[PDB]
Write a protein that binds this DNA or RNA. Structure first.
Length: 115
RNA sequence: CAGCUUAACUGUGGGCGUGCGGGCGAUACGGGCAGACUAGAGUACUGCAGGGGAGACUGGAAUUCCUGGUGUAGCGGUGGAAUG
Protein backbone atom coordinates (compact mmCIF):
# COMPACT_ATOMS: atom_id res chain seq x y z
CA UNK A 1 0.00 0.00 0.00
CA UNK A 2 2.62 2.52 1.12
CA UNK A 3 6.33 1.68 0.91
CA UNK A 4 8.65 4.69 0.44
CA UNK A 5 11.84 2.66 0.44
CA UNK A 6 11.82 -0.48 -1.67
CA UNK A 7 14.01 -3.07 -3.33
CA UNK A 8 14.23 -3.77 -7.05
CA UNK A 9 15.20 -7.36 -7.77
CA UNK A 10 16.34 -7.71 -11.37
CA UNK A 11 16.82 -11.15 -12.91
CA UNK A 12 18.43 -10.49 -16.29
CA UNK A 13 19.04 -13.78 -18.07
CA UNK A 14 19.92 -14.59 -21.66
CA UNK A 15 16.20 -14.97 -22.39
CA UNK A 16 14.36 -12.43 -20.23
CA UNK A 17 14.56 -9.58 -17.77
CA UNK A 18 12.26 -9.86 -14.77
CA UNK A 19 11.90 -6.97 -12.34
CA UNK A 20 10.25 -7.27 -8.93
CA UNK A 21 9.74 -4.20 -6.77
CA UNK A 22 9.34 -5.30 -3.18
CA UNK A 23 9.29 -4.00 0.31
CA UNK A 24 12.65 -4.40 2.08
CA UNK A 25 11.24 -7.46 3.83
CA UNK A 26 10.90 -9.01 0.36
CA UNK A 27 7.14 -8.96 -0.08
CA UNK A 28 6.52 -8.09 -3.70
CA UNK A 29 4.31 -5.12 -4.45
CA UNK A 30 4.86 -4.88 -8.20
CA UNK A 31 6.66 -6.63 -10.98
CA UNK A 32 7.12 -6.59 -14.70
CA UNK A 33 8.68 -8.77 -17.35
CA UNK A 34 9.21 -8.44 -21.06
CA UNK A 35 6.30 -10.75 -21.73
CA UNK A 36 4.15 -8.51 -19.56
CA UNK A 37 5.19 -5.35 -21.41
CA UNK A 38 4.41 -7.05 -24.68
CA UNK A 39 7.27 -9.13 -25.95
CA UNK A 40 7.76 -12.75 -26.88
CA UNK A 41 10.56 -15.17 -27.54
CA UNK A 42 13.99 -13.69 -28.12
CA UNK A 43 12.95 -10.04 -27.97
CA UNK A 44 12.47 -10.61 -24.24
CA UNK A 45 16.27 -10.83 -24.03
CA UNK A 46 16.88 -7.37 -25.43
CA UNK A 47 17.79 -4.36 -23.30
CA UNK A 48 14.83 -2.41 -24.65
CA UNK A 49 12.49 -5.04 -23.26
CA UNK A 50 14.19 -4.52 -19.92
CA UNK A 51 13.78 -0.77 -20.30
CA UNK A 52 10.03 -1.28 -20.66
CA UNK A 53 9.79 -3.90 -17.92
CA UNK A 54 11.65 -1.71 -15.46
CA UNK A 55 9.53 1.26 -16.51
CA UNK A 56 6.25 -0.58 -15.98
CA UNK A 57 7.26 -2.05 -12.63
CA UNK A 58 8.49 1.38 -11.55
CA UNK A 59 5.18 2.96 -12.47
CA UNK A 60 3.23 0.27 -10.63
CA UNK A 61 5.44 0.94 -7.61
CA UNK A 62 5.06 4.71 -7.86
CA UNK A 63 1.34 3.95 -7.66
CA UNK A 64 2.11 2.39 -4.26
CA UNK A 65 4.41 5.22 -3.17
CA UNK A 66 7.95 4.00 -3.74
CA UNK A 67 10.63 6.66 -4.23
CA UNK A 68 14.00 5.30 -3.12
CA UNK A 69 14.91 1.83 -4.31
CA UNK A 70 17.87 -0.41 -3.58
CA UNK A 71 18.73 -2.62 -6.50
CA UNK A 72 19.67 -6.29 -6.37
CA UNK A 73 20.71 -7.35 -9.84
CA UNK A 74 21.48 -10.90 -10.84
CA UNK A 75 22.18 -12.72 -14.06
CA UNK A 76 24.43 -11.93 -17.03
CA UNK A 77 21.83 -10.51 -19.38
CA UNK A 78 22.34 -7.35 -21.35
CA UNK A 79 19.56 -5.12 -19.99
CA UNK A 80 20.84 -4.78 -16.45
CA UNK A 81 22.15 -1.22 -16.74
CA UNK A 82 19.33 -0.46 -19.14
CA UNK A 83 16.84 -1.40 -16.43
CA UNK A 84 18.79 0.71 -13.94
CA UNK A 85 18.48 3.72 -16.22
CA UNK A 86 14.81 2.91 -16.74
CA UNK A 87 14.07 2.91 -13.03
CA UNK A 88 16.05 6.13 -12.67
CA UNK A 89 13.91 7.67 -15.42
CA UNK A 90 10.52 6.30 -14.33
CA UNK A 91 10.37 8.52 -11.23
CA UNK A 92 12.46 6.48 -8.81
CA UNK A 93 15.92 7.11 -7.43
CA UNK A 94 18.37 4.30 -6.84
CA UNK A 95 20.39 4.19 -3.66
CA UNK A 96 22.47 1.04 -3.90
CA UNK A 97 23.45 -1.54 -6.50
CA UNK A 98 24.42 -5.11 -5.70
CA UNK A 99 25.38 -8.05 -7.90
CA UNK A 100 23.68 -10.87 -6.02
CA UNK A 101 24.20 -13.49 -8.67
CA UNK A 102 24.43 -17.03 -7.26
CA UNK A 103 28.09 -18.04 -7.10
CA UNK A 104 28.12 -21.73 -6.20
CA UNK A 105 31.14 -23.18 -4.47
CA UNK A 106 31.52 -25.85 -7.15
CA UNK A 107 28.34 -27.72 -6.40
CA UNK A 108 25.57 -29.25 -8.46
CA UNK A 109 27.04 -30.17 -11.87
CA UNK A 110 25.81 -27.90 -14.66
CA UNK A 111 24.07 -29.04 -17.81
CA UNK A 112 26.29 -30.35 -20.55
CA UNK A 113 27.97 -28.11 -23.09
CA UNK A 114 25.86 -27.20 -26.10
CA UNK A 115 27.10 -28.27 -29.53
C1' C B 1 102.63 -81.31 -58.73
C1' A B 2 101.68 -85.34 -61.99
C1' G B 3 98.71 -88.17 -65.50
C1' C B 4 94.29 -89.13 -69.37
C1' U B 5 96.23 -85.16 -76.47
C1' U B 6 93.63 -80.56 -73.21
C1' A B 7 89.71 -79.85 -69.84
C1' A B 8 86.21 -82.27 -67.02
C1' C B 9 88.09 -86.33 -64.44
C1' U B 10 91.86 -89.02 -61.82
C1' G B 11 95.93 -89.67 -58.58
C1' U B 12 100.11 -88.01 -55.13
C1' G B 13 101.65 -84.70 -51.03
C1' G B 14 100.46 -80.81 -47.84
C1' G B 15 96.84 -77.60 -45.72
C1' C B 16 91.80 -77.58 -43.94
C1' G B 17 89.30 -80.67 -40.60
C1' U B 18 86.03 -74.21 -38.26
C1' G B 19 86.29 -78.64 -32.74
C1' C B 20 87.05 -82.25 -28.69
C1' G B 21 89.99 -84.72 -25.16
C1' G B 22 94.78 -85.37 -22.08
C1' G B 23 99.66 -82.92 -20.50
C1' C B 24 102.60 -78.56 -19.55
C1' G B 25 102.52 -73.19 -18.91
C1' A B 26 100.48 -67.34 -18.04
C1' U B 27 96.96 -64.98 -14.59
C1' A B 28 95.47 -59.15 -17.19
C1' C B 29 89.92 -59.71 -17.51
C1' G B 30 85.44 -62.53 -16.06
C1' G B 31 84.29 -66.06 -12.36
C1' G B 32 84.88 -69.11 -7.70
C1' C B 33 87.11 -69.05 -2.60
C1' A B 34 88.98 -66.38 1.46
C1' G B 35 89.08 -61.36 3.11
C1' A B 36 89.41 -55.74 3.28
C1' C B 37 87.09 -50.62 1.91
C1' U B 38 83.29 -46.85 1.44
C1' A B 39 82.27 -43.40 -3.32
C1' G B 40 76.62 -47.25 -4.83
C1' A B 41 72.55 -49.19 -1.92
C1' G B 42 70.19 -49.23 2.71
C1' U B 43 69.77 -47.74 8.23
C1' A B 44 70.12 -44.04 12.27
C1' C B 45 69.84 -38.58 13.94
C1' U B 46 68.23 -33.71 12.90
C1' G B 47 65.06 -30.78 9.99
C1' C B 48 61.62 -29.69 5.82
C1' A B 49 57.63 -29.54 2.18
C1' G B 50 53.45 -31.68 0.39
C1' G B 51 45.36 -31.97 -2.71
C1' G B 52 50.12 -38.85 -1.06
C1' G B 53 46.40 -42.48 1.06
C1' A B 54 42.38 -44.52 4.48
C1' G B 55 38.64 -43.75 8.41
C1' A B 56 35.34 -40.67 11.33
C1' C B 57 33.01 -36.13 12.26
C1' U B 58 31.76 -31.63 10.27
C1' G B 59 31.05 -26.48 7.51
C1' G B 60 28.92 -22.81 4.07
C1' A B 61 27.43 -21.36 -0.84
C1' A B 62 24.27 -22.97 -4.69
C1' U B 63 20.61 -26.08 -7.14
C1' U B 64 16.05 -28.90 -6.48
C1' C B 65 11.87 -30.08 -3.54
C1' C B 66 8.34 -29.02 0.53
C1' U B 67 5.63 -25.48 3.75
C1' G B 68 4.07 -20.47 4.47
C1' G B 69 3.69 -15.02 3.31
C1' U B 70 3.92 -11.03 -0.78
C1' G B 71 2.45 -11.17 -5.64
C1' U B 72 0.32 -11.31 -10.09
C1' A B 73 0.26 -13.02 -15.52
C1' G B 74 3.34 -15.14 -17.78
C1' C B 75 7.72 -18.22 -17.18
C1' G B 76 11.03 -21.33 -19.57
C1' G B 77 13.64 -22.09 -23.89
C1' U B 78 15.94 -21.10 -29.08
C1' G B 79 19.33 -19.41 -34.47
C1' G B 80 14.06 -18.80 -34.35
C1' A B 81 10.40 -21.55 -32.04
C1' A B 82 7.51 -25.39 -30.03
C1' U B 83 6.83 -29.16 -26.56
C1' G B 84 6.65 -28.09 -21.28
Amino acid sequence: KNVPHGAAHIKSTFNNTIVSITDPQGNVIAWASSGHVGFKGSRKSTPFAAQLAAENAARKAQEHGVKKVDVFVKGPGSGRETAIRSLQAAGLEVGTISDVTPQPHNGCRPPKRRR
